[PDB]
RNA sequence: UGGAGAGUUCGAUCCUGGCUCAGGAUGAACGCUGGCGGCAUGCUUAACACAUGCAAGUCGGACGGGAAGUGGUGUUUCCAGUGGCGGACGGGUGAGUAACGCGUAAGAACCUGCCCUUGGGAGGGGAACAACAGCUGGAAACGGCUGCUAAUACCCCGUAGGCUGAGAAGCAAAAGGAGGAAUCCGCCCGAGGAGGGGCUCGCGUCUGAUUAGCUAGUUGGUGAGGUAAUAGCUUACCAAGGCGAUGAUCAGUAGCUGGUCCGAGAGGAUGAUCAGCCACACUGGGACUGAGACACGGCCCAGACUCCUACGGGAGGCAGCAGUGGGGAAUUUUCCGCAAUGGGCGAAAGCCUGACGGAGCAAUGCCGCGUGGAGGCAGAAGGCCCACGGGUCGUGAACUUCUUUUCCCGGAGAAGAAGCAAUGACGGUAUCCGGGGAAUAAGCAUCGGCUAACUCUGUGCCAGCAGCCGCGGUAAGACAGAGGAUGCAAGCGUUAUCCGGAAUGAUUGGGCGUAAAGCGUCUGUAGGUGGCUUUUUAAGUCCGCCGUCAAAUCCCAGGGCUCAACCCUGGACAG
């Protein structure tokens, strides 16, 4: 199936952390077939598609405990 | 060190489940093949061999009632399952019209 | 230049490529033991005693090696290392010997070239 | 689906025309046109088209391993050599 | 925003032309030397043979239980066993394969666990079975009989949209379990979505034609058989074709690509690391289970090896991590952790996880810093040259004031943790404050010309040098040592290898009277090219637009680690 999170392209002790939509019979950082949004640990850059998320999430598409957090520090996930 | 009790870790005890997970599914593989070459015996041979006098029930649909029954109850487990189970009742459906006197 | 419409019909293409010193595949240094230690005269116009000798490396084959500077310790049964490369002045000799490695010692009180020859630094 | 002209060289087949396509393309490197001509098995199930007729062969549905393309139309007749 | 050459074939000149060198690069080795830090990287040679440990287990909110540990006086939790899911994910190697493997662009005859949208159903029964128990065959492995037993183990019956069929009609599914005054999860069928995985077609995909012929299910057509599915995939029969110089077949070699290196570009050479795809995993063969692998840590058979044996008979295979032997010029700690990200399982907790996050070894490379700073003589010793009247090494040093990164020692101490009894491996972490003292830290190559840099001795075609032209037979800046100088830098030098220089295969870029080069001359098929006018087509071509051209490289602009390397946003480009 396919699912919500963040994968690796900093190594060492930057952790920059990508984008997803990838499936959970690949790799941890492998093949992302479409792009969103991804944030920096030691900094204020968060970024996270609106239009891109709920979009793919009707689909099939499994939220877990990474992409979450970060999608209720914003303005989205909310009783609106 | 080594432990006081005794213990091996089989791997023969995957390969007996998947040994009786085969038992069952060839057994009714191997039903719904005898079965259809009984009645792919009796629609070569053309039976219309009539004996019974209380239900004039022809030979050559009477096996073919039992080859659709032997074939949709092997849709229901792992052995066959759809699109294939519908080929199956296709090929007998089409041979008993097609070698058939009018 | 040859005409475009014979360079779809034959299409130029270079060789299968000749090597200078035939060091196995792709490799810069090569083991081997030495067979004969003999001594040879140069071409026309050089005329001195040239120490050469026939090193048998890892492979099978036994080609001729030439040793540097003044003075060396090679028997007839030294595990010496060769380098590759042409003195272009002794016909046949194609490759050249890394002193200070292995078997083959270093030039005794040289105090120029210490990267080359194998020679220690001396207090 | 992909359409491609092209004329039928071989016809002493049982339901099955050779077709032989003709293509002119330009050289990436170079410039020149290079031409390329290769054959493909057409079916014909009504054996109307015969030797050195050209038709249009479009995509279907493979009916053997080397056949998977249907000649469909006729843009003219017969231009062969003569017997 | 990109394109410098020179030396050598002559008495000499101008051409032609081969060779050689200056450059950059390489997952490199060797020799000399060797202060650290950041980031990356590390058998490229035997896909050789492998000690040991570890690399996949998890659920009792599916069951009959309870051999451990902790409470209470039976609940957590849980060794085995039944059952569910995952072992076809991840990791590694590239041997094989030039092939429908891969890359690009299209297509139809499909399947598809977990997830998700919608509708209906989930009733009522049966017979066993491990675990366990009593015996029992064997060295061991592995088991052999009898009896008892549960479930979301299994098999009927009832019902049924779907399936088969022109139609009428025929016919097939089930699991229950948990917290709570009825919620949650799960079960069965069908119709979709998504994602993944098959199958079809065309182009581009190495070299050699002193491999030109190749091919019987071989090509195709009817009929049955078969697969999830099209299909010669298969069988019988009929036709006899099918492939090839825009080069099949055969032989040698090889994973493909995104990209990497060089180059002005084109192009050439490759494709280590990262990522996509394919293939293999002791060798050969086969099937089973399952949605999916005919499947590294699964099974069965055969073979070569290793090991055990009460020789009757059996157990394994690291092209997983770390390591051993061996080969080799050469390539590392049999370390720590789940904390973070991810994978498996579970309504969770949590457990498993050398994937991974980190540390360790190695100047392998890239980047940054440091090993002292200013001041100091009329140029001190001591060396080298000297016409000995001096000069030079030399401000170099000593001598003086000064600052002390990094290393060392002591005290603090951000963040990577979001979760959320406050949860980290790395960490005596980054970084910050202070204290001794320059105190602990440089070499290597070269010096005839291209090549940037000089003489004096010794030797003396002797010993030796050397990329090329060439040096050495008594005064050779091209040998050996010294003084000095040049270049670079903890790197330097050498070697190997690709590209550049080679407009020396030139498509952009060359030539054939004499320097290498028109075949001895014609005819002529395929192929290439083709006068002039109008109309038309518009295929090529050209314009615009819509898809795809994965991401990451490269490039432009802009950010974050004190800079940089490195990391990162968007755009550009992907011709």
């Known amino acids: ?80 | 060190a080594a432990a006081p009790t005794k213990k091996a870790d089989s791997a023969a005890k995957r390969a007996r489940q998947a040994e009786k997970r085969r038992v069952y599914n060839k057994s009714k593989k191997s039903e719904a093949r005898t079965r259809m070459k009984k009645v792919l015996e009796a629609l070569e041979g053309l039976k219309k061999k009539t004996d019974a006098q209380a239900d004039e029930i022809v030979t050559v649909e009477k096996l073919i009632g039992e080859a659709y029954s032997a074939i949709d109850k092997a849709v229901k487990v792992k052995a066959l399952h759809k699109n294939t189970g519908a080929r199956r009742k296709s090929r007998l459906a089409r041979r008993k019209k097609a070698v058939e006197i009018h | 230049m040859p005409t475009i419409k014979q360079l779809i019909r034959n299409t130029r293409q270079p060789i299968r490529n000749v090597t200078k010193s035939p060091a196995l595949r792709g490799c810069p240094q090569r083991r081997g033991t030495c067979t004969r230690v003999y001594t040879i005269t140069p071409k026309k116009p050089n005329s001195a005693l040239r120490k050469v000798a026939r090193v048998r490396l890892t492979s099978g084959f036994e080609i001729t090696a030439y040793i540097p500077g003044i003075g060396h310790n090679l028997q007839e049964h030294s595990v010496v290392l060769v380098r590759g490369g042409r003195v272009k002045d002794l016909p046949g000799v194609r490759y050249h010997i890394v002193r200070g490695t292995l078997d083959a010692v270093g030039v005794k009180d040289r105090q120029q070239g210490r990267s080359k020859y194998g020679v220690k630094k001396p207090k | ?83």
């Open chain 4, 1 to 83: 689906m992909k359409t491609m002209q092209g004329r039928v060289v071989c016809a002493t087949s049982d339901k099955t025309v050779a077709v032989e396509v003709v293509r002119l393309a330009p050289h990436p490197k170079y410039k020149r046109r290079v031409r390329m001509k290769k054959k493909y098995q057409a079916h014909d199930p009504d054996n109307q088209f015969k030797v050195g007729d050209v038709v249009r062969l479009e995509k279907s549905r493979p009916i053997s391993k080397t056949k998977s393309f249907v000649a469909l139309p006729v843009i003219a007749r017969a231009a062969r050599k003569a017997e």
């Open chain 1, 1 to 80: 199936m396919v699912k919500l999170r963040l994968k690796r392209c900093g190594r060492k002790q930057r952790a920059v952390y990508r984008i997803v939509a990838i499936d959970v019979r690949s790799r941890r950082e492998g093949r992302d077939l479409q792009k969103v949004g991804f944030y920096d640990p030691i900094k204020s850059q968060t970024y996270l598609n609106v239009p891109a998320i709920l979009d793919f999430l009707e689909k099939g598409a499994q939220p877990t405990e990474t992409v979450y957090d970060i999608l209720k520090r914003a303005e989205v996930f909310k009783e609106f």
